[PDB]
JSON list of C-alpha atoms and ligand atoms in Angstrom, two decimals:
[
{"chain": "D", "resi": 1, "resn": "UNK", "atom": "CA", "xyz": [0.00, 0.00, 0.00]},
{"chain": "D", "resi": 2, "resn": "UNK", "atom": "CA", "xyz": [1.39, 3.39, -1.01]},
{"chain": "D", "resi": 3, "resn": "UNK", "atom": "CA", "xyz": [0.13, 6.68, 0.40]},
{"chain": "D", "resi": 4, "resn": "UNK", "atom": "CA", "xyz": [1.24, 10.28, -0.02]},
{"chain": "D", "resi": 5, "resn": "UNK", "atom": "CA", "xyz": [1.76, 12.72, 2.86]},
{"chain": "D", "resi": 6, "resn": "UNK", "atom": "CA", "xyz": [2.39, 16.47, 2.37]},
{"chain": "D", "resi": 7, "resn": "UNK", "atom": "CA", "xyz": [3.67, 18.60, 5.25]},
{"chain": "D", "resi": 8, "resn": "UNK", "atom": "CA", "xyz": [2.94, 22.34, 5.38]},
{"chain": "D", "resi": 9, "resn": "UNK", "atom": "CA", "xyz": [3.27, 25.22, 7.85]},
{"chain": "D", "resi": 10, "resn": "UNK", "atom": "CA", "xyz": [5.20, 28.39, 8.71]},
{"chain": "D", "resi": 11, "resn": "UNK", "atom": "CA", "xyz": [8.85, 28.71, 8.01]},
{"chain": "D", "resi": 12, "resn": "UNK", "atom": "CA", "xyz": [11.18, 27.22, 10.59]},
{"chain": "D", "resi": 13, "resn": "UNK", "atom": "CA", "xyz": [8.31, 25.60, 12.48]},
{"chain": "D", "resi": 14, "resn": "UNK", "atom": "CA", "xyz": [10.07, 22.18, 12.38]},
{"chain": "D", "resi": 15, "resn": "UNK", "atom": "CA", "xyz": [8.63, 20.37, 9.37]},
{"chain": "D", "resi": 16, "resn": "UNK", "atom": "CA", "xyz": [11.85, 19.03, 7.91]},
{"chain": "D", "resi": 17, "resn": "UNK", "atom": "CA", "xyz": [13.26, 17.97, 11.29]},
{"chain": "D", "resi": 18, "resn": "UNK", "atom": "CA", "xyz": [10.04, 16.05, 11.99]},
{"chain": "D", "resi": 19, "resn": "UNK", "atom": "CA", "xyz": [10.23, 14.13, 8.70]},
{"chain": "D", "resi": 20, "resn": "UNK", "atom": "CA", "xyz": [13.96, 13.38, 9.16]},
{"chain": "D", "resi": 21, "resn": "UNK", "atom": "CA", "xyz": [13.78, 12.15, 12.77]},
{"chain": "D", "resi": 22, "resn": "UNK", "atom": "CA", "xyz": [10.99, 9.85, 11.66]},
{"chain": "D", "resi": 23, "resn": "UNK", "atom": "CA", "xyz": [12.76, 8.52, 8.52]},
{"chain": "D", "resi": 24, "resn": "UNK", "atom": "CA", "xyz": [16.52, 8.69, 9.14]},
{"chain": "D", "resi": 25, "resn": "UNK", "atom": "CA", "xyz": [16.79, 8.81, 12.95]},
{"chain": "D", "resi": 26, "resn": "UNK", "atom": "CA", "xyz": [19.20, 11.76, 12.61]},
{"chain": "D", "resi": 27, "resn": "UNK", "atom": "CA", "xyz": [18.46, 15.37, 13.73]},
{"chain": "D", "resi": 28, "resn": "UNK", "atom": "CA", "xyz": [19.83, 17.77, 11.11]},
{"chain": "D", "resi": 29, "resn": "UNK", "atom": "CA", "xyz": [22.68, 20.00, 12.29]},
{"chain": "D", "resi": 30, "resn": "UNK", "atom": "CA", "xyz": [22.19, 23.13, 10.09]},
{"chain": "D", "resi": 31, "resn": "UNK", "atom": "CA", "xyz": [18.84, 25.02, 9.56]},
{"chain": "D", "resi": 32, "resn": "UNK", "atom": "CA", "xyz": [18.43, 25.17, 5.85]},
{"chain": "D", "resi": 33, "resn": "UNK", "atom": "CA", "xyz": [15.08, 26.46, 4.49]},
{"chain": "D", "resi": 34, "resn": "UNK", "atom": "CA", "xyz": [13.35, 23.91, 2.30]},
{"chain": "D", "resi": 35, "resn": "UNK", "atom": "CA", "xyz": [12.62, 24.51, -1.34]},
{"chain": "D", "resi": 36, "resn": "UNK", "atom": "CA", "xyz": [11.09, 21.06, -1.81]},
{"chain": "D", "resi": 37, "resn": "UNK", "atom": "CA", "xyz": [12.18, 17.60, -0.75]},
{"chain": "D", "resi": 38, "resn": "UNK", "atom": "CA", "xyz": [11.05, 13.97, -0.71]},
{"chain": "D", "resi": 39, "resn": "UNK", "atom": "CA", "xyz": [11.53, 11.21, 1.84]},
{"chain": "D", "resi": 40, "resn": "UNK", "atom": "CA", "xyz": [10.01, 7.75, 2.39]},
{"chain": "D", "resi": 41, "resn": "UNK", "atom": "CA", "xyz": [8.92, 6.00, 5.58]},
{"chain": "D", "resi": 42, "resn": "UNK", "atom": "CA", "xyz": [7.66, 2.45, 5.99]},
{"chain": "D", "resi": 43, "resn": "UNK", "atom": "CA", "xyz": [5.05, 2.22, 8.72]},
{"chain": "D", "resi": 44, "resn": "UNK", "atom": "CA", "xyz": [2.71, -0.52, 9.93]},
{"chain": "D", "resi": 45, "resn": "UNK", "atom": "CA", "xyz": [-0.67, 0.28, 11.54]},
{"chain": "D", "resi": 46, "resn": "UNK", "atom": "CA", "xyz": [-3.50, -2.06, 12.46]},
{"chain": "D", "resi": 47, "resn": "UNK", "atom": "CA", "xyz": [-1.49, -4.78, 10.76]},
{"chain": "D", "resi": 48, "resn": "UNK", "atom": "CA", "xyz": [-1.44, -2.78, 7.52]},
{"chain": "D", "resi": 49, "resn": "UNK", "atom": "CA", "xyz": [1.88, -2.39, 5.66]},
{"chain": "D", "resi": 50, "resn": "UNK", "atom": "CA", "xyz": [2.27, 1.19, 4.29]},
{"chain": "D", "resi": 51, "resn": "UNK", "atom": "CA", "xyz": [4.93, 2.94, 2.28]},
{"chain": "D", "resi": 52, "resn": "UNK", "atom": "CA", "xyz": [4.45, 6.62, 3.14]},
{"chain": "D", "resi": 53, "resn": "UNK", "atom": "CA", "xyz": [5.87, 9.11, 0.64]},
{"chain": "D", "resi": 54, "resn": "UNK", "atom": "CA", "xyz": [6.81, 12.23, 2.63]},
{"chain": "D", "resi": 55, "resn": "UNK", "atom": "CA", "xyz": [6.61, 15.38, 0.58]},
{"chain": "D", "resi": 56, "resn": "UNK", "atom": "CA", "xyz": [8.38, 18.28, 2.30]},
{"chain": "D", "resi": 57, "resn": "UNK", "atom": "CA", "xyz": [7.42, 21.83, 1.37]},
{"chain": "D", "resi": 58, "resn": "UNK", "atom": "CA", "xyz": [8.61, 25.38, 1.92]},
{"chain": "D", "resi": 59, "resn": "UNK", "atom": "CA", "xyz": [7.31, 27.58, 4.68]},
{"chain": "D", "resi": 60, "resn": "UNK", "atom": "CA", "xyz": [9.08, 30.60, 3.21]},
{"chain": "D", "resi": 61, "resn": "UNK", "atom": "CA", "xyz": [6.94, 33.01, 1.19]},
{"chain": "D", "resi": 62, "resn": "UNK", "atom": "CA", "xyz": [9.75, 33.09, -1.36]},
{"chain": "D", "resi": 63, "resn": "UNK", "atom": "CA", "xyz": [8.46, 29.70, -2.50]},
{"chain": "D", "resi": 64, "resn": "UNK", "atom": "CA", "xyz": [4.69, 30.13, -2.28]},
{"chain": "D", "resi": 65, "resn": "UNK", "atom": "CA", "xyz": [4.20, 29.59, -6.00]},
{"chain": "D", "resi": 66, "resn": "UNK", "atom": "CA", "xyz": [6.24, 26.34, -5.93]},
{"chain": "D", "resi": 67, "resn": "UNK", "atom": "CA", "xyz": [4.50, 24.76, -2.91]},
{"chain": "D", "resi": 68, "resn": "UNK", "atom": "CA", "xyz": [1.19, 23.91, -4.66]},
{"chain": "D", "resi": 69, "resn": "UNK", "atom": "CA", "xyz": [3.06, 21.59, -7.08]},
{"chain": "D", "resi": 70, "resn": "UNK", "atom": "CA", "xyz": [3.35, 19.17, -4.20]},
{"chain": "D", "resi": 71, "resn": "UNK", "atom": "CA", "xyz": [-0.41, 18.85, -3.61]},
{"chain": "D", "resi": 72, "resn": "UNK", "atom": "CA", "xyz": [-1.67, 16.55, -6.38]},
{"chain": "D", "resi": 73, "resn": "UNK", "atom": "CA", "xyz": [-3.10, 13.25, -5.23]},
{"chain": "D", "resi": 74, "resn": "UNK", "atom": "CA", "xyz": [-2.31, 13.71, -1.57]},
{"chain": "D", "resi": 75, "resn": "UNK", "atom": "CA", "xyz": [-3.69, 11.19, 0.94]},
{"chain": "D", "resi": 76, "resn": "UNK", "atom": "CA", "xyz": [-2.99, 13.06, 4.22]},
{"chain": "D", "resi": 77, "resn": "UNK", "atom": "CA", "xyz": [-1.70, 16.51, 5.23]},
{"chain": "D", "resi": 78, "resn": "UNK", "atom": "CA", "xyz": [0.41, 17.28, 8.26]},
{"chain": "D", "resi": 79, "resn": "UNK", "atom": "CA", "xyz": [-0.36, 20.95, 8.96]},
{"chain": "D", "resi": 80, "resn": "UNK", "atom": "CA", "xyz": [2.16, 22.24, 11.44]},
{"chain": "D", "resi": 81, "resn": "UNK", "atom": "CA", "xyz": [2.89, 25.17, 13.75]},
{"chain": "D", "resi": 82, "resn": "UNK", "atom": "CA", "xyz": [5.49, 25.51, 16.49]},
{"chain": "D", "resi": 83, "resn": "UNK", "atom": "CA", "xyz": [4.58, 25.54, 20.16]},
{"chain": "D", "resi": 84, "resn": "UNK", "atom": "CA", "xyz": [7.26, 28.21, 20.65]},
{"chain": "D", "resi": 85, "resn": "UNK", "atom": "CA", "xyz": [5.43, 30.55, 18.24]},
{"chain": "D", "resi": 86, "resn": "UNK", "atom": "CA", "xyz": [1.82, 31.60, 18.94]},
{"chain": "D", "resi": 87, "resn": "UNK", "atom": "CA", "xyz": [1.75, 33.45, 15.63]},
{"chain": "D", "resi": 88, "resn": "UNK", "atom": "CA", "xyz": [2.49, 30.22, 13.80]},
{"chain": "D", "resi": 89, "resn": "UNK", "atom": "CA", "xyz": [-0.77, 28.87, 15.25]},
{"chain": "D", "resi": 90, "resn": "UNK", "atom": "CA", "xyz": [-2.64, 32.03, 14.32]},
{"chain": "D", "resi": 91, "resn": "UNK", "atom": "CA", "xyz": [-1.43, 31.52, 10.75]},
{"chain": "D", "resi": 92, "resn": "UNK", "atom": "CA", "xyz": [-3.17, 28.13, 10.53]},
{"chain": "D", "resi": 93, "resn": "UNK", "atom": "CA", "xyz": [-6.58, 29.65, 9.67]},
{"chain": "D", "resi": 94, "resn": "UNK", "atom": "CA", "xyz": [-5.02, 32.73, 8.06]},
{"chain": "D", "resi": 95, "resn": "UNK", "atom": "CA", "xyz": [-3.00, 30.98, 5.39]},
{"chain": "D", "resi": 96, "resn": "UNK", "atom": "CA", "xyz": [-2.53, 27.21, 5.74]},
{"chain": "D", "resi": 97, "resn": "UNK", "atom": "CA", "xyz": [-6.12, 26.05, 5.88]},
{"chain": "D", "resi": 98, "resn": "UNK", "atom": "CA", "xyz": [-7.31, 28.31, 3.03]},
{"chain": "D", "resi": 99, "resn": "UNK", "atom": "CA", "xyz": [-4.50, 27.03, 0.86]},
{"chain": "D", "resi": 100, "resn": "UNK", "atom": "CA", "xyz": [-4.93, 23.33, 1.65]},
{"chain": "D", "resi": 101, "resn": "UNK", "atom": "CA", "xyz": [-8.71, 23.55, 1.37]},
{"chain": "D", "resi": 102, "resn": "UNK", "atom": "CA", "xyz": [-8.35, 24.94, -2.12]},
{"chain": "D", "resi": 103, "resn": "UNK", "atom": "CA", "xyz": [-5.84, 22.44, -3.50]},
{"chain": "D", "resi": 104, "resn": "UNK", "atom": "CA", "xyz": [-6.84, 19.36, -1.42]},
{"chain": "D", "resi": 105, "resn": "UNK", "atom": "CA", "xyz": [-10.40, 20.16, -0.21]},
{"chain": "D", "resi": 106, "resn": "UNK", "atom": "CA", "xyz": [-11.38, 16.74, 1.26]},
{"chain": "D", "resi": 107, "resn": "UNK", "atom": "CA", "xyz": [-7.98, 15.35, 2.29]},
{"chain": "D", "resi": 108, "resn": "UNK", "atom": "CA", "xyz": [-7.66, 14.67, 6.04]},
{"chain": "D", "resi": 109, "resn": "UNK", "atom": "CA", "xyz": [-5.58, 17.12, 8.04]},
{"chain": "D", "resi": 110, "resn": "UNK", "atom": "CA", "xyz": [-3.57, 16.35, 11.17]},
{"chain": "D", "resi": 111, "resn": "UNK", "atom": "CA", "xyz": [-2.83, 19.62, 13.02]},
{"chain": "D", "resi": 112, "resn": "UNK", "atom": "CA", "xyz": [0.60, 19.16, 14.58]},
{"chain": "D", "resi": 113, "resn": "UNK", "atom": "CA", "xyz": [2.30, 21.30, 17.23]},
{"chain": "D", "resi": 114, "resn": "UNK", "atom": "CA", "xyz": [6.05, 20.96, 16.89]},
{"chain": "D", "resi": 115, "resn": "UNK", "atom": "CA", "xyz": [8.84, 21.79, 19.29]},
{"chain": "D", "resi": 116, "resn": "UNK", "atom": "CA", "xyz": [6.97, 20.56, 22.36]},
{"chain": "D", "resi": 117, "resn": "UNK", "atom": "CA", "xyz": [10.30, 20.54, 24.18]},
{"chain": "D", "resi": 118, "resn": "UNK", "atom": "CA", "xyz": [10.22, 24.35, 24.20]},
{"chain": "D", "resi": 119, "resn": "UNK", "atom": "CA", "xyz": [6.98, 24.70, 26.19]},
{"chain": "D", "resi": 120, "resn": "UNK", "atom": "CA", "xyz": [8.93, 24.58, 29.45]},
{"chain": "D", "resi": 121, "resn": "UNK", "atom": "CA", "xyz": [12.13, 26.16, 28.08]},
{"chain": "D", "resi": 122, "resn": "UNK", "atom": "CA", "xyz": [13.23, 29.20, 30.08]},
{"chain": "D", "resi": 123, "resn": "UNK", "atom": "CA", "xyz": [14.70, 31.13, 27.14]},
{"chain": "D", "resi": 124, "resn": "UNK", "atom": "CA", "xyz": [11.56, 30.62, 25.13]},
{"chain": "D", "resi": 125, "resn": "UNK", "atom": "CA", "xyz": [9.29, 31.70, 27.96]},
{"chain": "D", "resi": 126, "resn": "UNK", "atom": "CA", "xyz": [11.39, 34.78, 28.68]},
{"chain": "D", "resi": 127, "resn": "UNK", "atom": "CA", "xyz": [11.52, 35.82, 24.98]},
{"chain": "D", "resi": 128, "resn": "UNK", "atom": "CA", "xyz": [7.82, 35.42, 24.50]},
{"chain": "D", "resi": 129, "resn": "UNK", "atom": "CA", "xyz": [6.99, 37.23, 27.74]},
{"chain": "D", "resi": 130, "resn": "UNK", "atom": "CA", "xyz": [8.56, 40.28, 26.11]},
{"chain": "D", "resi": 131, "resn": "UNK", "atom": "CA", "xyz": [5.56, 40.31, 23.74]},
{"chain": "D", "resi": 132, "resn": "UNK", "atom": "CA", "xyz": [3.20, 39.33, 26.58]},
{"chain": "D", "resi": 133, "resn": "UNK", "atom": "CA", "xyz": [2.98, 35.90, 25.00]},
{"chain": "D", "resi": 134, "resn": "UNK", "atom": "CA", "xyz": [3.77, 32.38, 26.10]},
{"chain": "D", "resi": 135, "resn": "UNK", "atom": "CA", "xyz": [4.09, 29.01, 24.40]},
{"chain": "D", "resi": 136, "resn": "UNK", "atom": "CA", "xyz": [1.04, 27.58, 22.76]},
{"chain": "D", "resi": 137, "resn": "UNK", "atom": "CA", "xyz": [-1.09, 25.63, 25.23]},
{"chain": "D", "resi": 138, "resn": "UNK", "atom": "CA", "xyz": [-2.31, 22.18, 24.29]},
{"chain": "D", "resi": 139, "resn": "UNK", "atom": "CA", "xyz": [-5.86, 23.36, 24.76]},
{"chain": "D", "resi": 140, "resn": "UNK", "atom": "CA", "xyz": [-5.29, 26.12, 22.20]},
{"chain": "D", "resi": 141, "resn": "UNK", "atom": "CA", "xyz": [-3.92, 23.71, 19.62]},
{"chain": "D", "resi": 142, "resn": "UNK", "atom": "CA", "xyz": [-6.80, 21.32, 20.15]},
{"chain": "D", "resi": 143, "resn": "UNK", "atom": "CA", "xyz": [-9.35, 24.17, 19.87]},
{"chain": "D", "resi": 144, "resn": "UNK", "atom": "CA", "xyz": [-7.82, 25.16, 16.53]},
{"chain": "D", "resi": 145, "resn": "UNK", "atom": "CA", "xyz": [-7.92, 21.52, 15.35]},
{"chain": "D", "resi": 146, "resn": "UNK", "atom": "CA", "xyz": [-11.62, 21.48, 16.00]},
{"chain": "D", "resi": 147, "resn": "UNK", "atom": "CA", "xyz": [-12.17, 24.87, 14.37]},
{"chain": "D", "resi": 148, "resn": "UNK", "atom": "CA", "xyz": [-10.52, 23.81, 11.10]},
{"chain": "D", "resi": 149, "resn": "UNK", "atom": "CA", "xyz": [-12.07, 20.36, 11.00]},
{"chain": "D", "resi": 150, "resn": "UNK", "atom": "CA", "xyz": [-8.87, 18.41, 11.43]},
{"chain": "D", "resi": 151, "resn": "UNK", "atom": "CA", "xyz": [-8.84, 14.64, 11.66]},
{"chain": "D", "resi": 152, "resn": "UNK", "atom": "CA", "xyz": [-6.75, 14.95, 14.79]},
{"chain": "D", "resi": 153, "resn": "UNK", "atom": "CA", "xyz": [-4.44, 17.14, 16.91]},
{"chain": "D", "resi": 154, "resn": "UNK", "atom": "CA", "xyz": [-0.96, 15.94, 17.92]},
{"chain": "D", "resi": 155, "resn": "UNK", "atom": "CA", "xyz": [2.09, 17.44, 19.63]},
{"chain": "D", "resi": 156, "resn": "UNK", "atom": "CA", "xyz": [5.66, 16.32, 19.25]},
{"chain": "D", "resi": 157, "resn": "UNK", "atom": "CA", "xyz": [9.31, 17.12, 19.65]},
{"chain": "D", "resi": 158, "resn": "UNK", "atom": "CA", "xyz": [11.64, 16.11, 16.81]},
{"chain": "D", "resi": 159, "resn": "UNK", "atom": "CA", "xyz": [14.49, 17.04, 19.14]},
{"chain": "D", "resi": 160, "resn": "UNK", "atom": "CA", "xyz": [13.63, 14.48, 21.84]},
{"chain": "D", "resi": 161, "resn": "UNK", "atom": "CA", "xyz": [11.40, 12.24, 19.67]},
{"chain": "D", "resi": 162, "resn": "UNK", "atom": "CA", "xyz": [8.42, 12.63, 22.06]},
{"chain": "D", "resi": 163, "resn": "UNK", "atom": "CA", "xyz": [5.25, 11.92, 20.12]},
{"chain": "D", "resi": 164, "resn": "UNK", "atom": "CA", "xyz": [6.85, 11.60, 16.70]},
{"chain": "D", "resi": 165, "resn": "UNK", "atom": "CA", "xyz": [5.86, 8.00, 16.13]},
{"chain": "D", "resi": 166, "resn": "UNK", "atom": "CA", "xyz": [2.26, 8.72, 17.03]},
{"chain": "D", "resi": 167, "resn": "UNK", "atom": "CA", "xyz": [2.05, 11.61, 14.57]},
{"chain": "D", "resi": 168, "resn": "UNK", "atom": "CA", "xyz": [2.95, 9.32, 11.66]},
{"chain": "D", "resi": 169, "resn": "UNK", "atom": "CA", "xyz": [0.78, 6.46, 12.95]},
{"chain": "D", "resi": 170, "resn": "UNK", "atom": "CA", "xyz": [-2.19, 8.83, 13.03]},
{"chain": "D", "resi": 171, "resn": "UNK", "atom": "CA", "xyz": [-1.34, 10.27, 9.64]},
{"chain": "D", "resi": 172, "resn": "UNK", "atom": "CA", "xyz": [-1.17, 6.77, 8.17]},
{"chain": "D", "resi": 173, "resn": "UNK", "atom": "CA", "xyz": [-4.51, 5.79, 9.70]},
{"chain": "D", "resi": 174, "resn": "UNK", "atom": "CA", "xyz": [-5.99, 8.93, 8.24]},
{"chain": "D", "resi": 175, "resn": "UNK", "atom": "CA", "xyz": [-4.46, 8.21, 4.85]},
{"chain": "D", "resi": 176, "resn": "UNK", "atom": "CA", "xyz": [-5.90, 4.69, 4.84]},
{"chain": "D", "resi": 177, "resn": "UNK", "atom": "CA", "xyz": [-9.48, 5.68, 5.65]},
{"chain": "A", "resi": 1, "resn": "GNP", "atom": "N1", "xyz": [13.93, 22.91, 20.12]},
{"chain": "A", "resi": 1, "resn": "GNP", "atom": "C1", "xyz": [13.54, 22.38, 18.94]},
{"chain": "A", "resi": 1, "resn": "GNP", "atom": "N2", "xyz": [13.99, 22.91, 17.82]},
{"chain": "A", "resi": 1, "resn": "GNP", "atom": "C2", "xyz": [13.57, 22.26, 16.70]},
{"chain": "A", "resi": 1, "resn": "GNP", "atom": "C3", "xyz": [12.71, 21.19, 16.63]},
{"chain": "A", "resi": 1, "resn": "GNP", "atom": "N3", "xyz": [12.48, 20.83, 15.32]},
{"chain": "A", "resi": 1, "resn": "GNP", "atom": "C4", "xyz": [13.18, 21.66, 14.59]},
{"chain": "A", "resi": 1, "resn": "GNP", "atom": "N4", "xyz": [13.86, 22.55, 15.39]},
{"chain": "A", "resi": 1, "resn": "GNP", "atom": "C5", "xyz": [14.75, 23.63, 14.96]},
{"chain": "A", "resi": 1, "resn": "GNP", "atom": "O1", "xyz": [14.03, 24.62, 14.27]},
{"chain": "A", "resi": 1, "resn": "GNP", "atom": "C6", "xyz": [14.72, 25.09, 13.09]},
{"chain": "A", "resi": 1, "resn": "GNP", "atom": "C7", "xyz": [13.85, 24.89, 11.87]},
{"chain": "A", "resi": 1, "resn": "GNP", "atom": "O2", "xyz": [13.52, 23.51, 11.71]},
{"chain": "A", "resi": 1, "resn": "GNP", "atom": "P1", "xyz": [13.13, 22.93, 10.29]},
{"chain": "A", "resi": 1, "resn": "GNP", "atom": "O3", "xyz": [12.63, 21.56, 10.47]},
{"chain": "A", "resi": 1, "resn": "GNP", "atom": "O4", "xyz": [14.24, 23.10, 9.33]},
{"chain": "A", "resi": 1, "resn": "GNP", "atom": "O5", "xyz": [11.94, 23.86, 9.89]},
{"chain": "A", "resi": 1, "resn": "GNP", "atom": "P2", "xyz": [11.02, 23.92, 8.62]},
{"chain": "A", "resi": 1, "resn": "GNP", "atom": "O6", "xyz": [9.62, 24.06, 9.08]},
{"chain": "A", "resi": 1, "resn": "GNP", "atom": "O7", "xyz": [11.36, 22.74, 7.77]},
{"chain": "A", "resi": 1, "resn": "GNP", "atom": "N5", "xyz": [11.44, 25.23, 7.78]},
{"chain": "A", "resi": 1, "resn": "GNP", "atom": "P3", "xyz": [11.21, 25.63, 6.23]},
{"chain": "A", "resi": 1, "resn": "GNP", "atom": "O8", "xyz": [9.76, 25.85, 6.08]},
{"chain": "A", "resi": 1, "resn": "GNP", "atom": "O9", "xyz": [11.99, 26.89, 6.06]},
{"chain": "A", "resi": 1, "resn": "GNP", "atom": "O10", "xyz": [11.74, 24.45, 5.44]},
{"chain": "A", "resi": 1, "resn": "GNP", "atom": "C8", "xyz": [16.03, 24.33, 13.01]},
{"chain": "A", "resi": 1, "resn": "GNP", "atom": "O11", "xyz": [17.01, 25.18, 13.61]},
{"chain": "A", "resi": 1, "resn": "GNP", "atom": "C9", "xyz": [15.73, 23.13, 13.90]},
{"chain": "A", "resi": 1, "resn": "GNP", "atom": "O12", "xyz": [16.88, 22.64, 14.57]},
{"chain": "A", "resi": 1, "resn": "GNP", "atom": "C10", "xyz": [12.22, 20.61, 17.82]},
{"chain": "A", "resi": 1, "resn": "GNP", "atom": "O13", "xyz": [11.46, 19.64, 17.95]},
{"chain": "A", "resi": 1, "resn": "GNP", "atom": "N6", "xyz": [12.69, 21.30, 18.94]},
{"chain": "A", "resi": 2, "resn": "MG", "atom": "MG1", "xyz": [12.04, 22.56, 5.86]},
{"chain": "A", "resi": 3, "resn": "MG", "atom": "MG1", "xyz": [-0.45, 36.00, 10.19]}
]
């Protein structure tokens, strides 16, 4: 069984790192903005054997006209924000859902909060407190998931691996149904 996954979301919100930790076990050393990229992951869910094509896309506006070339015939979308960036969550209904809904109107969406390891990070909390902000709360992520009609809401850390497996298990289930 082959299924296609496309990952989207604000620049630097952790998309590439999430695909790599899942499919190569290594955590990339240098932050390099994505143009486009492809990876493959073999996953097994409910005794079903699945070869998941992972289509990585650009968060940078520089590449907005390129990103839609990745959408044909998608089976599941991972729509991401970073827990260290409340504005990246605000941009989910502003830009990511409108775009996905247009190109892939009925494809299931998993809303994914990345960088969970930064929720309790002192530097992050101090930096955001300067703007009278704080890390995204799980309740806020889950509210947004409901608002946009996502299949599910998941949090993870590519850095520590917490929750990564479950994101891809959920995405595969979604892709199969
Ligand atoms: N603390 C922490 N940092 C992370 C995590 N995942 C990625 N990062 C860091 O965040 C930066 C951007 O990550 P990356 O995956 O490249 O982001 P992206 O969403 O693919 N960006 P683009 O849209 O530009 O391709 C990198 O410096 C990376 O090390 C995570 O789980 N925790
Ligand atoms: Mg990237
Ligand atoms: Mg915005």
